[PDB]
Subunit: 305 residues, 6 copies
């Protein structure tokens, strides 16, 4: 009655999820045409079934989005009973406001494409902005890596009782104060004179944990680390839920005084972990598997929060 499919080369996360649920990934034929034009073909019947498609992790964001939309469309017209998009890292989530410009609100375009593609429900983790849930009319379940992060902080950082949760920018305030409140420690924030960086909050003679929802080139995260050192920080960690490590990223964190860099399984990290030793990954496949099972059985998903 339940069916789980995956997209593109990536299958690590999808395979983990399927295993935890005691299922095999559904059969899906995929042939890439001329100019990356995506071809997808559901290798089995999904008629009357509760379908879950897990987003691929093949870097190319536009090929991934299209493959996901095409799969959703194929299942829908193949009379699937319900289609849910499991998207650990919501694409274009950062493009969620005009920001004083003649810019697109791409995250809303995406929510609309997903909806028109035929998605009936969304399962994602740590939306860049909680307001994005409102970009849909269909139900969205936004999971959190926070519990896992807190737990990891307590078990791997000895001086955590007196550490400081630091935000790379002004926009991450709420995220770090929330984590800082749970741990009962101090918080601090860095801001790039929008240039030089300014820091508010107490980090002197104590471990500084940089927390952010995501990191790409890691330019910011690496500069914030140097700043924290100059501020007299003991050791600076960097915890991200989504590790879009790209470009300089790999070399940057190595050449950075990061004691360690923790990221989740929301994006493939096997390739980068090899060329970067200070990187550790928190597996969130169990959380995702549990939300699917609970969504299917109609049980509480908020429990995982």
């Amino acid at each position: 009655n339940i069916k789980i499919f995956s997209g593109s080369s990536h299958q690590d996360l999808s395979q983990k999820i399927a295993d935890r649920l005691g299922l095999e990934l559904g059969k899906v034929v995929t042939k890439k045409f001329s100019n990356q034009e995506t071809c997808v073909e559901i290798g089995e019947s999904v008629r009357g079934e509760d379908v879950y498609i897990v987003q691929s992790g093949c870097g190319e964001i536009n090929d991934n989005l299209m493959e996901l939309l095409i799969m959703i469309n194929a299942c829908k017209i193949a009379s699937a009973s319900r289609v849910t998009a499991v998207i650990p890292c919501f694409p274009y989530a950062r493009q969620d406001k005009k920001d004083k410009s003649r810019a697109p609100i791409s995250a809303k375009l995406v929510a609309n494409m997903l909806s028109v593609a035929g998605a009936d429900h969304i399962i994602t983790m740590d939306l860049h902005a909680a307001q994005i849930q409102g970009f849909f009319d269909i139900p969205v379940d936004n999971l959190y890596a926070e519990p896992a992060v807190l737990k990891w902080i307590r078990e791997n950082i000895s001086e955590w009782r007196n550490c400081t949760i630091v935000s790379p920018d002004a926009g991450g305030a709420k995220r770090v104060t929330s984590i800082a409140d749970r741990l009962n420690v101090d918080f601090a924030l860095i801001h790039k004179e929008r240039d030089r960086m300014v820091l508010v909050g107490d980090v002197k003679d104590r471990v500084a944990i940089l927390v952010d929802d995501m990191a790409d080139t890691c330019g910011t995260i690496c500069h914030a680390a140097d700043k924290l050192l100059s501020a007299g920080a003991t050791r600076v960690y960097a915890i991200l839920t989504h590790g879009i490590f790209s470009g300089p990223a790999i070399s940057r964190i190595n050449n950075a005084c990061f004691e360690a860099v923790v990221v989740t399984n929301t994006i493939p990290q096997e390739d980068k972990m090899k060329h970067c030793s200070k990187i550790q990954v928190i597996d969130i496949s169990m959380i995702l598997a549990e939300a699917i099972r609970r969504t299917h059985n109609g049980e509480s998903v908020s429990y995982l929060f």
Copy 2:
């Protein structure tokens, strides 16, 4: 071929806007029942016209919202060419996320209600969260009171070049860092844990609490004490939307504020009578200009950093 109508008897703001455009407000016959069931009738033809309806300032948010929706409906089925909702202070804006609870995203519901009611365009000031524009599919022009605030500051605070812009909560960091950078001064943030914590330099400086709105004012009043305790010379509070419900007025009269500044996105006259610490910045010209430019198809972005 422009037509401007006002929500209810609170013509106040809507009449200033109309004056600035060289127009009179459109005729609207409004009958109301005991259960507050709103009756509306457009007293003039709006056929083929560019209509603007400015939300009333009554105070009762559900009556005002329904009256706005009803007027939009009436104009749309009366063949208005276009209907724009001018909503200075967006209703339910603070209810824009589930926040880890089985809560409604009321701001999204409101956007959908305005949409199905027949709204073709929205004009508002300082949405509680910029992401709210994404709750609509129709175009939204979110005007800023910033230019007017930066001007009030430069013109009313002698020490502005050495002041600190303070956010009353963590969520406002971006807004204050933004004003601090334009002015080239320090910024600071207050985070409520039931204890307030302050990060940022305010010692021997004038502290300016800046936020989008103030309701019961319990937060800004407490932040002010915190700031003085931290060595601030004097404290100001500048919010774009002055709700001031409940004990706010009494709370402000007893607070150590040098002054509390708000725009007139919400009627402030009654409140001022009982509170002298309040000063109002008029934003009718900014709204009047967005409407005029919207109608003429001219740039409205000019208003984001320019006081007409």
Copy 3:
């Protein structure tokens, strides 16, 4: 699997319905903000459930409507399987046509808001105009108080065999002729020179029963009564399904020669019944409970007609 929630202070009707169904009302947190801004929070999971929200009866029509829409939205995004709005007295139902004016068709605005809020089905009683069912694309079940009214007329009025069903205005013709046909008696109608009132039909030397779907200030209903007396009516009753008694209402019916005024439970009457003795209420909670149960079990609801 089934869940029933109620809104605002009112809970009399909702509690009766829940009891008849052997259920407790679902947990819903409610805190009213500054200017009556409505805050609602579903106190329990409704994921995969058949949900029924019963409209509150706290007079303020706009606060009631909003609270209902907000509750519907919260349940919908909380992954409820289906949401049904049980609205005994459909708000703005009288505003269902332009009527030769540049007026809104508010009843349609409401149907649209309800639909966009996420309602999948509507259960109401005695719609002001049957055409309102067409203002929705979703299924609407319009229940009738008629059977109960007829029954009440037979058991409480001795001279009913030869009474006259009277309509307060020209617009209630169909309503009274239908009831008059079932009882096999005469019908009459009153009209305000649209002023003085005119009456057509035979009421001389016989009990006159004024029937209408609703009454607010009761100005009309009270004038029609005086008229009926001058016409030589024996005794004049007034039967309404929706008793929006407001303003003068209470005092008016007392100072009116009404033998009795019968209304249904669709709107709270406990407060007004105290200051008005000639008022009797027909409880329709059983009818509503039965339509919900039948809607849930997929059984015939028309049976209740």
Copy 4:
């Protein structure tokens, strides 16, 4: 930049309207199959233009409806700037409620079909029930034949100042009381139980049966007898829509009517040949005016109580 097209060969009404606007009807190539499958082709460009399609009077309601929908579709995908459906007599209008049965609300389905077909505006005359405007989300202008009826009455019935306007059923009370009040005379109502009952004064007065439409005329014919039996001097019947299907014509030729008056919202020529009691009120000018004003963005409400 206005374009008017006719449903089918029943140019009749559509040609009068066109004449009154100083226009010719647009070219339309129409091919039809044996199974009545309608083929349509807009013989001229409608790109960027204000299009009006007037429903044909063929008689076969489903063929006419489909032909109308098809033409609307063709114009819309051919980039017409706006497409208005001019439907004098709204199809399935009598099917506007479930009426306690597991019935379809066909009038709502029709409104949805016209909407999805691409209609941006509707112009009709005397909807069977005003609530029908609410079946659409697009604007609807529901014109009244009342002004024309009140004029025919004042001009054709000597005793109009002492006549009685009678409704053939309970549902028409509002419509007759409305005409009775404007004229300042009595009104009466007939209710069918299989026996008719009459309430209202008709004794020694001219009785005018007024309704929105007459089909088989079984009702108005029986009401007329009832009225004469009640002491009416003579009986008239004035309906806006003259369907006259089945035995209607034979039924009218044998009825005690002084005359039967209808508008030309439906072709009446063939019917008149076999029935001399029929007289037609031309409403083309009223429709032509609503179109002209719709196009110019001018008040159409003027027509509700004024015969152009």
Copy 5:
């Protein structure tokens, strides 16, 4: 739980389908008003049921379409759980493109009307163009008569091993090459100088089987037959899935050298078969019944392909 209704006078196909499923056709009241205005009334409850309405076969295409839409609407607002339109011969399917004219895409108008009427799923046979499935957003299952046609060709035509599948026009190329490939024979195509007819492909001294999705007046089909004869064809058959035989049709095929004309049950043929002997019908009721049963039980429908 499952309910099958039929429309208008036609009930042959609908009755066959119901029998194969072991059911009686649902009760539906139908009274035709003045000018063919369609009146429909569901004679039984369909609340919470999986409903299937089979299109009538009463020639008048517009009365049939409307009756179908009206039935769909009535079931939908009567709280039916799901409504599926079973339409063997999709109306206006040939009007599926502008074709270099200011023409309507009627097939899309129809798909939209069906959708707005409330249809949740479509079951049809041999769509004039497969692209029409894309005119809907709802699931469409397009069945094929091909298997049955091939089978019939093998059992009724002795020289089939060396016959030629002929297309009446250029537009039927794909249809005939597909059938010709399955049988492993030659294909040919005829074209009207768009006049005289041209023929490409080898038909000399061999049976010619004209294949087309539909035939109305049969003008084309009959001319193609004469052409095939002049080309030196042994015997010319004509196989159509949809036999819209109208106008001259009946007389035309008789006066035509057609060895035989095969058509399916998608349209009533009992009346025409009497006045035309060379006509044979392949019953597709079992195929339709099987798709309904499979759609209801959530089993594979593609199996029938």
Copy 6:
């Protein structure tokens, strides 16, 4: 009040179109990330304007599609009066049916994406299947390269009056019979079973393979051999959309083609450098004209059989 913008740096076609209209391309600030996440910013106001966005020729179809959708979104929420998507070569057009498989109808998904993105009108050239217009509800103008092809033929092939127009597959019969009839010559069709079969007269005649698009060219290359083997004098291949991915170029350089002709609906410069058998027909004037007429509300059908 017309505004034309280009998808990406592949201004090529979009710049020619702009030149032909006497305009410059609108300013667009485009930032792109490593994961190819597209960032766009309209560098000028489009408020109340008629906007045209011409899809880029980058090559990566998903990046180009997303960039197009994003730009449409940005313009729409920036209050453009109308936004038209000029898509010379429609993405996923070949994926327009299930074809007896549990496949997606990607061309329909793309139409829906463009619709919800906010597209009000589509302008494309030679949709793979005319039925694709029906995948939208908004108007679509599907331009033909035929007039330009018929002209290239008459002007470049001496024997055109005695040539044969050949379809590389069964599905193209209609398209070739159509060109064959206008020219008044023979036609032929090739059907791939893994063996090609040819029906039609090509003996001693110049054979012109005509199709809407050519990708890997495996088919046209094989069809050419087949044609020469059948007695064709020489073979040509004329496709409107020149994809030429994979081994196409190498495949064409080794094929027995006299020449391979394509339009510039897709950039062809890089391909031409490595392939001299390729010749390009410029269709910018045809696209420029459709835009100009679309904007002025003038007939665009004129272009279906007339080379501007």
